[model samples]
Target: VNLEEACLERCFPQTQRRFRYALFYIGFACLLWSIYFAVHMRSRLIVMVAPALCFLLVCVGFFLFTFTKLYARHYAWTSLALTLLVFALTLAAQFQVLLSQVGSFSMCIEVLFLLYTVMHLPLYLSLCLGVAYSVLFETFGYHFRHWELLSRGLLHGCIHAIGVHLFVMSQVRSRSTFLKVGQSIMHGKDLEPPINQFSLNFLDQELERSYRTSYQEEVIKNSPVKTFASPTFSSLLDVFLSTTVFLTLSTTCFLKYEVPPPPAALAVFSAALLLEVLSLAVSIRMVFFLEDVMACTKRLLEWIAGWLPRHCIGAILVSLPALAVYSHVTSEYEFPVFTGSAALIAVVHYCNFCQLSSWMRSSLATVVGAGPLLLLYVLIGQEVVLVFFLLLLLVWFLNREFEVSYRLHYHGDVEADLHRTKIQSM
Candidate 1:
C-alpha cells in the first residue's frame, strides 16, 4: 500500500504538470496568432487573411493538445476538428451567397451558417461568432450600400447570441459536475473507501445475495440483443416526430400573425428548430438510451451519414408546406422558398455532425439536462441559445470515454457474476 501510494504521488503530479504545460502552450500560441493577425491585417484583407490564419493556428494548437496526455485526452483533436469543420462550412456557404447576385440565396446561406454554428460549436464560441458575423454584415452591408438590410442582420445576430448563451449556461453546471467526477476518477479518488468497514461489508453481502437470487430466477436475459438493436430506426423516428410537431406549430404561428417575415427568415427558423430538435434527441439518446455498442457504431457511422440529408429533409418538409399555404392564400408563390431551403439544409447537416457523440451524453447530464432547451433554441431563432447548445456539445464531445470492461465467466462463481451484474445495473 505504501509503495503504491508513493508511486502514484510521483506519477499523478507528473501527469498533471504535463497537462498544464500543454494547455499553456496551446493558449499562448492562439493568443499570439490572434494578436499578430489583428495587428497586421487591413480591414479589406481581414476577411480573407484572418480566417485563414485563425484556421491554421487552431489546427496546429489542436493537434499538439490532442497528441499530449491531458484530461480526457483522445477527443481533443476530434472536438477541434469538428468545430473547425463547422466554421469552415459556414464561411464557405456565406461566401457563396455574398459573391452571387441572389438576395434570397444570401439570406438562406447566412441563416444556415448560424444554424450550423449553433449545432456544433461551443455556446460561447458560437455566440461570439454569431455576434462577430452580425457586426461584420451590418458594418459591411452599410458601407457597401446594402444598408437597408443591416438592422435585420444585427437583430438576427443578437437574438442568436442571447438564445445560445441561455441554452449553454443551462447545461454548463451539469458538464462541470461531470468533469469533476472525471477528475476524481482520474486522480484515483473515486475508489476511496467509505468509513465503517463492518457496515460496508454487510451491505456488500446483501447486494451479492440479491443479485444472485434475481439472476437465478430470471430466465431470459437479453443483454446481447439489447446491445445490438439498431439506433438508426429510433433516431429516424425521433427526427420525423420532432420535425412534424415543430413545423406544424411554427408555420401556424407565422401565418396567423400580420408581422411579415422574410422568406429567408422563415426558412432559417424552420431549419434551426428542426436541427435543434434532432440535436436534442440525439443528445438524450446518447445519455439515456444509447448502449455502449451503439456508441461505438455512432462514431463510425457519423462520418458516413454526414449532416446534409437530414437538413435537406427538414428544409423540404417545412418549405413545401409553407409555399403551398402561401400560394393558396395569396394566389401567388410570393416567397422564394427553394433557395433558403437549400441553405438551411446544409446548415442543419453541419450542426448534427458537430454535436452527436457519446461523451456529450454523460457530461451535459451533470448540470441541467439540455434535452428541452435544445428544443426551445430550435423554435426560437436566437443565436445565443444556439451558442449554448454548441458549447455543451463541445464539452461533451471533447471528453474521453472510460470503459471498465471485465470478464465474468461464471466459472462456478455464480455469486461473483451476480454481484458484478448488480453493480452494473445500478
Candidate 2:
C-alpha cells in the first residue's frame, strides 16, 4: 500500500474506537443541553446560550479527537491540533456574536475548514470534508434561516473546491521535481566533470579577456565590500522609498476618491495587499541572506515536491465532478472563476519553487527587479500592466540574467603579510 493508505489503515481503527465513543458522549451532552434550554427555560438568554453550548460541545469533541490521535500515535498530532484549533476558533467566533447569523457562521467555518483540510489531510479526505461542510452549512445553516442559501453555498463550495484542488496540484508538481533531484543526488551523475573542449576554450578565452581588460586587477583593488556596499545600501533605500510612495498613493486614492470602500471590496483588497506584502518581504529576505534562503527553499521545495503530486491528482479527480454538480445546481459560474484563480496561483507558486531552487544564484538585483512588478500587479488597475509584469518574469527566467554575481571576494594577501612580519621580528 502507499503511504497514505498505510496511514489511513493504521489510523482508522483508533478513530473508530475511542474517537467515535468520545463524539457520541459529546453529542449526548449537546442534546441534553438543547433539551434543557428548550424545556426548562424559554428565555432569550437560554436561547443564546444554546448555540454557545453547541459550540462548546464541538470544541470538546475536537479536543477529544486530538487527544486520542496523540495518544494512539496513528498520525501527526500537530496536524490534528491545527485542525481542532481552526474549528475551535471558528466556533468561538460564532459564540462571540461576530458570526451571529447562521449564514455568516457557515461562511467563516467553511473557509477555515477548507484551508486547514487542504494542508493537513489527503486529497480524498479534503474533498470529502469540503463537500460535507458545504452541504451541512447550506442545508442546516442557510436554508433553515431562509437566507440566500443557494448562492452563498455555491460561492463557498466553489472557493473551497478551488483552494483545495489547486493546492493539491502544486504539491504534485513539486514532488515530481523532488524525485528528479533525489535521483540526481543518488546516481552521482550531477557532478560530472566538464568534457566539452569548446566550453573549456570559451572559459579560457573569458579569463584572457578579463586580464586584457584589467578587470580582475580592478575588481581586486576595489574590494567588493567597498565597491558594492554603497550600491546595496542605495538599493535598500530605493525599496523603502518605493514602498512608502506606493503606500501613500494607495492610501490617498482610497481616502480622497473612495473615502470608504464597500466592506467586501475593502476585505478583498486588504487580504490581497497583505499577501503581496508578505510575498515581497519573503523575496527580499531571500535575496539579502542567500545561504539561509537557499537552505529553507530546498527544504520547502523538497517537501512540496514530495507531497504535491498525489494530493493534487486526488483533489482534481474528486473535486471536478462535485464542482460541476455544485455549479449546475446553483446556476452560477463564479465557482469556475475561483477555481481558475486558484490554479493560476498554484502555477505562480512554481515561480516561488524555482526561486528557491536557484536561491544560491539569486541576489538583491533579482528581488528589486521583481518587487516592482509584483507591486504593479497588486496596486495598479491596468490589465496591461499585469501582462507586462508576467512577460518580464518570463523573459527573466528564459534569459537567466539576474544581473547579480554570486562570487565572494577576499581582500589582501594574509600569508604574505604574515611571512613579512616573521622576517621583521627575526
Candidate 3:
C-alpha cells in the first residue's frame, strides 16, 4: 500500500540512533543550564526548570520511539508535536531571562542547537521546523537593540545554513537507498525465483553486493577514463574555487587587520590551502596530461583519491573559510565581508555537486554562472546569506531533474518492463 511510509519504517533504526544522540546532547546542555541557574540565580531557577523539564519529557518520548514498535506507528506525529512544544517552552524561558542580556547570545546558540536537533527528524518535519525557526530568528534580529547582538544572530544563521545543506543531503541519500532497495526487489520479482530465495532480505543483500561491484564492472567494460572524468572534473572545480576564496581571505586578513590572524589559524588555513593547490596540480595532471602519457600516474592518482579520505579533506577545505571568518568576525565585529564568503564557500560546494553528471552541460553552466552573482549578494550584507541559502534550496530541487536524467540514462529499458506489465494485465 504505502511504500513511502514503509520506507520510513525500514529506515527507522538509523534515524532513531541520530534521535537518541541528539536528545542526549540537548538534555545534557539543559542539565548544565539548570546547574548554572540554580547556583547563580537561585530565585530565577524556575525559568530554567521549565525548559529543562520540557526537554526531559521530549527525551522520554524519543525513548518510546527507540525501544518500542510505536515508533513505526506513532513516531512521525509524536516527534513533530514534541519538538514544537519544546521550542515554544524554550523561547518562553528565554524571554523570562532577557533582563540579563545573556539571553541574546545564548538564544542564538539555542537556535543553532535546535536546528541541529531538527535534522534528526523526518525530512518534511525537518524542513518545516528549520524554516520556521530561521524565519523567526531572523525576524527577531530586526528588533535587536545592538549591532553585536544582530551580528551574532547572523553568524549563527550562516552556520545553520551549513546544517541545512547537510540535512538535505542526508535525507536525499536515505531516499536514494530506499529507492535502490525497492528497485532491486522489483527486478527480483520478475525472475520468479524459489519462495525461500525470493525475499526482501535476500534482495537487500544482493543489491548491496552489486553496489560494490556494479560500478567497477561498468568501468572495466567501458572507458575507465570517461567513467571517472565526471567526478574528477567536479572535484577539480571545487578545489579551485575553494583555493581562490581562501587566498582572497588570507591576503585580506594579512593586509587589512590590525592584529594578524592567529598563527594557529594561519597555519591550518595555509596547510589546507597548500593541499588544495597540490590536489589541483595533481588532479589536472591526472585528468589531461597523465592519462595520455602515463597510465601509472593516472592509476596512482585515482587510487589516492579513493583511498585518502577525499571527502574529509574537502569538508576541511570548505570548513576552514568559515573558521577564518568566525575568527575575523569575533576580532573585528565586521560581519559583511567574511560571513558572506563563509556562507558562499559552503553553498558553492553544494552547487558544484549538481554538476557531478558532467555531461549535463546545463547543470555545469547553472552552478558556475550563479557563483559570482551569489557571492555578490552576500558581499552586500551578511543577512543576504539567507537569500543565497534560498538559492541553495532552489539548486537542490533543480538537481532532482538531473538525477532523473541520470536514472533514465542508466535504466532506459524500464519502459519495456512497464509495457510488458500492461500486456500481461490485459
Candidate 4:
C-alpha cells in the first residue's frame, strides 16, 4: 500500500494536476447550468443558490491557494470533495430533490461519477465510492417508489452493472500504463525524451509485436470456429444492448405510466440518455474510423479490451433476460416467460464459465444469475422462493471468504499480485 502510494505520487503528478483542473471546469459548468435552470424555472432559488455559491467560493479559495507553496495530497482531496459536493448539488438543483427524497438521478450522472472516480482516485477508493453511490441510488429509488418499481430496479441494476464494469476495466488500463511508466523510470529511462527517441519505446514495440505473434499462433493452433467475431464485436453488441435498454425503459415509463415521472426521475433518465449516446458515439467511431479514432473513443476501447468477454456483455445479457421476466409478469400473457428468461440466464452462465474458472466462475454465476430470481420472487410475492433466494444470497456472500482464500492459494505468487496491485493502483 505504501509502495503503491509512493509510486503514484511520483508518477501521477501531471495526471493529478490535470484531473483537478478538469474538475474545476466541469464543476463550474455543471453548477452554472444547474443554477440557471433552477432560476429559469422560478421554482427553487435558495436550494440552488447555496450550493452554487459554496462551490464558487471554495473554487476561488482553492485557485488562490494553488498559487502559493502548497501540499499536494490535502489540496487534491479537498478539491475532489468540493467537486463531488458541487456535482451532487448540481444534480439536486436539476431534480429539486435530495438523495434522501424519492427520485432517480440520471444514469448519465452515475457514469460520470464512475469515470471521475476512476480518474481521480485509486482503484480501491474508486470501487468503494462507486459501490456506495450505486447502492444509495438503487435503495433510495426503491424505497421511494420513484418509478415503476420493478422496471426502475432492473434498469438501475443494469446501469450500475455497466458502470462498474467500465470502472474496473478503465482502472486496470490506467494501472497497466502506470506500471509500464514506473518500469521505464526504474530502468533509468529519460522521461524528457520524445517517446520514439527512447530505446524503451522500441523495446515495448517489439514486446507488443511478440504478444500479438503469440496470440495469433494460439488462435491458429486452436481450430474451433471459423469467422469468429472479435472483441470489437462483443463491445459493439454491448453498446447496442445498452441503447435498447435505455430506450425501452424510457418508452415504457413515459408512455405506459399515467403520471409523468418526478423531476428526479427525469433528471435520472436524462443523465442515462447522455451516457447511452456517449457510448453510441464511441461505437460509431470504432466502426467507421477504427484507426485514429477520437481520443476518448481510443481510451474507452483500451479499457473495453481489459474485460470484454465477461462483465461488459454479460451484464447487459443478464439485464435483458431479467427485464423480459419483468415485462412478462406485468403484461397480459397466456404463459409466464420464466422458461425463456431462465434459458437466457443459463446461457449467460455458460458464456461466463468460458471466461471464469472453478470457484470464481461459480461465485460470479451465483451472484449474477441469482439476483434476478431473487428480485422476481420478491416482486411477485413468492414468500417461499424469496426466502430461499435470500438465504442463497447470504450463503453466497458467506462463501466469498472461501473464494478469496482459494484465489490466494491458487495464484501462489500472491505477493507479486499484491505488489503489482499496489503499484498499479492510483
Residue 16 miss distance in model 3 (angstroms): 3.8
Give candidate 3's error at residue 138 in angstroms.
Answer: 5.4
What lDDT does candidate 3 reach at residue 190? Answer: 62
Estimate the lDDT of model 1: 0.36
Error of 2 at 87 (Å): 4.0
lDDT of 2 at 163: 49
Which is better, 1 or 2, measured by lDDT?
1
Instruction: Give the TM-score (vs. native) of candidate 4.
Output: 0.42
Off by over 4 Å in 4: 1-3, 31-35, 63-71, 87-104, 107-119, 122-125, 131-147, 182-426
lDDT of 1 by residue, 323-400 (tens): 322322232434222222222222222222111232232332322233322342241233323333333333332221
Better of 2 and 3 by TM-score: 3
- lDDT, candidate 4, equals 0.42
Candidates' RMSD to native: 16.5, 20.9, 12.8, 17.6
Q: How many backbone clashes does candidate 4 have?
A: 5
TM-score against native, each model: 0.30, 0.30, 0.51, 0.42
Expressed as tens digits, the lDDT of each residue in 181-211 for candidate 3 is 5665665566451012221111345433533
The residue pairs that clash in candidate 2, if any, are 168-312, 169-312, 171-308, 171-309, 172-308, 172-309, 174-305, 175-305
**Sorted by lDDT, highest first, which candidate order results?**
3, 4, 1, 2
Residue 12's lDDT within candidate 3 is 75
